[PDB]
């Protein structure tokens, strides 16, 4: 199936999911002189207070911080968006290098990673039907560049070697995601589409201006995760991030 790899990545996609050349896919480059603030938008609200994490998997692709997303617990309301958006789960995606590994850029510039915290419109009752509407999910990227560590991500980091593999789990509760957030809310926004196959086009995406800092430790425990399942031959979980599409019709708004 669809990958990262040469002959299952990002160019083939298209063959499987048409809409991999659509007129609103992401990432996206984004170009802060092109970006245009909107004084329309409205604060944006991160209320993840009485957010609950059940668990984490790899999928073969990155790996899934899942939340209970059967009640408004941790939801994004606010800036572009109209009405409650409920976390439903929340990865990365990274490089083999430092100097790679996020999906959008800004001003070209590739980052070590990025978090994409997955919210799903709750007027569609479910992420299944959501994902069937132009409005029904808000994506929250954020960029990861190594410095510092995060500690904050600690606990993410240090529950990786027990989900080494494809189709992995293992519970993750009481996990906090407000400690992956950086000071600053500014963010840009724009209509997109999921980075991963089957790639549909019903995000509006929220990317963050200022990324986090994690370690280089952090992200190299990052690495030594595998595509693979268990017992197949070892494939690195490394550079699973999709390049910069074609911003066609579309302009980029920035909350500041
Ligand atoms: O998911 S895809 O990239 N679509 O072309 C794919 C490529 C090779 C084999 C199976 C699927
Ligand atoms: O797609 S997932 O992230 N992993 O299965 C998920 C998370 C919460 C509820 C359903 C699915
Ligand atoms: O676009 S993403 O944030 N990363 O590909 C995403 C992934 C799964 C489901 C919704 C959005
Ligand atoms: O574009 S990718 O397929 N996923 O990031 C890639 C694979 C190997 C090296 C760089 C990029
Ligand atoms: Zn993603």
Known sequence: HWGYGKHNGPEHWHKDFPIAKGERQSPVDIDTHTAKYDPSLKPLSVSYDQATSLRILNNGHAFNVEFDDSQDKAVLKGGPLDGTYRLIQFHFHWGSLDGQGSEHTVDKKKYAAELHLVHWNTKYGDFGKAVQQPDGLAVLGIFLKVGSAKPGLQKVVDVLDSIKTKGKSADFTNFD???????????????????????????????????????????????????????????????????????KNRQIKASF
Request: charged fraction near 25%; glycine fraction near 6%.
């Open 177 to 247: 995601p407000r400690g992956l957030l950086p000071e600053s809310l500014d963010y840009w926004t724009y209509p997109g589409s999921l980075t991963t196959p089957p790639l549909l086009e019903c995000v509006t995406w929220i990317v963050l201006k200022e990324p986090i800092s994690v370690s280089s430790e952090q992200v190299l425990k990052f690495r030594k995760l595998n595509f693979n399942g268990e017992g197949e031959p070892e494939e690195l979980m490394v550079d699973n991030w999709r390049p910069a599409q074609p911003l």
